[PDB]
Amino acid sequence: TPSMEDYIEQIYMLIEEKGYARVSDIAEALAVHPSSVTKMVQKLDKDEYLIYEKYRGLVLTSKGKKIGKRLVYRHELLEQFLRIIGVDEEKIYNDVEGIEHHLSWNSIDRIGDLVQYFEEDDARKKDLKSIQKK
Amino acid sequence: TPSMEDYIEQIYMLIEEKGYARVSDIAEALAVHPSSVTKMVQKLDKDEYLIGLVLTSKGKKIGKRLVYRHELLEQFLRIIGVDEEKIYNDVEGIEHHLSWNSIDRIGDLVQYFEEDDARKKDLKSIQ
Fold it and tell me: Cβ separation of B101 and A117 shorter than 8 Å?
């Protein structure tokens, strides 16, 4: 059962490089009853995540765009993170997948400050690799 | 509902802070039906993790590792300055979904800031 968050992420991609999002497209990528999209897209509208453009179809409001873009950011940030601390590229996605839906934006924020702490220079992120060689 | 690990870990810690682990103690902590703790404890006893409830080398080994991973992820969140109130929640939610490879590096990363307070307060200033 995809989350209101999964939709917005999904509805985001289906809009990003697929014009706009049609209720059938959702019940596709998310792989769930096409009536579960209308049931949900109903609450998404109520939550100001998207409005329905007569004739054109569903589109995200600045809010939805915001929430959606932030989700995308969370995924890449977590991957950058796992990778920057030196984790088997193979694992990166695996772990990020498992954890991403279980972390507060507070952690996602401090993890950014963490990724920051390093990325700014290849040296400081070396000492990390030096400790890893044990 | 709690997984096999969640139980092992709970059995482990309880013995840690009381020496004993009672089904009631387990059920109360995990907020589950004691009947379920019972069903679990049987599976746990058959697969020889334990036998109040006592952990065998196996259960003891796994339990200690689960607790380490737990205390480590938390300590990690605290290190990078995460709201005291959110640490446990986030950790309880991500601890299971992180490979041991990731845990091992969170470890080295948790060590990086440990061998030099100049690094702990260094990040704090960037955040």
Answer: no
Cα–Cα distance for residue pair B76/B19, rounded to 1 Å: 28
- Experimental method reported for this structure: X-ray
Q: What resolution in angstroms, rounded to 1 decimal?
A: 2.8
The residue extents of the domains of chain A are 1-71, 72-134
Neighbours of A2 (CB within 10 A): 16
Q: Which of A25, A32, A68 is nearest to A60 (CA)?
A: A68
Record: fold of B1-66:
Arc Repressor Mutant, subunit A (1.10.10)
B34, B23 contact by CB (below 8 A): yes
Length of chain B: 127
Architecture of domain A1-71: Orthogonal Bundle (1.10)
Identify from B70, B73, B90, B102 which residue to disrupt to test chain A contact, counting A C-beta atoms within 10 A and taking the largest count. Answer: B102
